[PDB]
């Protein structure tokens, strides 16, 4: 594939700060280029954690998979540290569109199994049960 | 510059261009004179999206925390017609 | 900063302004939009009124309660032939019930 870690072996000291109001989940690409999921940060929390240099992460809201920006950008990927400063890994919530965001809502409120009795246009159903997911999202970056 | 938008119920809304540009449908819409009538958003609805714009404005290429935008359960579905409409 | 809603009757202005600023300034850029005096406006906060020497931080409006995703509502009436209306807000259309899929 292309969207996958390198087996570097070059340890990068990384700080997951999680500076939006979602819980996050951090998704780390295998070397296969496959998600592997890693530990919840709570809203508002940080924590210190060994990566290792070219090894590639993308970010989502754990309950939804919603994408999330790291560092203003979608994929963050390790540096090697320099004078024993850690890289920030500043996670935040995008400025969605306002469709997306209205369909976020939605998707909360109403169960999937009862989308399409709501009264909207069918365009809009299929929209609701197109779900964020992360094989959706690396599709776009690999072909880019 | 500023432009009015009209809800389908009377009520006007005065926003800046800039942030009424954010809308694809509007900017096309747009070119009365800095007018636009909006015949299926009612006023609740409309007020919420120009709230989106100011706030999408705001926080575009920002580096402040960016917070979340609230969409209260009552107006969820009328947003996302009118945001559908919209382009926005 | 602070965000706000100056509403009269069915008129809603969208603009943005700081805790520091005053009750006139204000004035100012709504002459700016509705191109009306500052001596015929009369600003207000939950009917309570607002001097034009005071702040948005001493009339209560606060950048926690004026967000760009939910602005602050102040009150306005205009003074039409030397006499000011009174506080007349439109309210918004009131959105329908839940579905029960809700």
Known sequence: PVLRSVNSREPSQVIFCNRSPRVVLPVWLNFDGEPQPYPTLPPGTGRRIHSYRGHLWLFRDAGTHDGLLVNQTELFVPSLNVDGQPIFANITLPVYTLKERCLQVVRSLVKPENYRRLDIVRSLYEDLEDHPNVQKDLERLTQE | ?88 | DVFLMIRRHKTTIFTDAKESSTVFELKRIVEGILKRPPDEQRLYKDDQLLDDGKTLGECGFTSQTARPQAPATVGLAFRADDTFEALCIEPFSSPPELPDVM
């Open chain 2, 1 to 88: 510059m500023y432009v009015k938008l009209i809800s389908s119920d009377g009520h006007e809304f005065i926003v800046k261009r800039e942030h009424a540009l954010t809308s694809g449908t509007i900017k096309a819409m747009l070119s009365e004179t800095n007018e636009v009538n909006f015949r299926e958003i009612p006023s609740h609805v409309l007020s919420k999206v120009c709230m989106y714009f100011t706030y999408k404005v705001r926080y575009t290429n920002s580096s402040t925390e960016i917070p979340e935008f609230p969409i209260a359960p009552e107006i969820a579905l009328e947003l996302l017609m009118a945001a559908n409409f919209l382009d926005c």
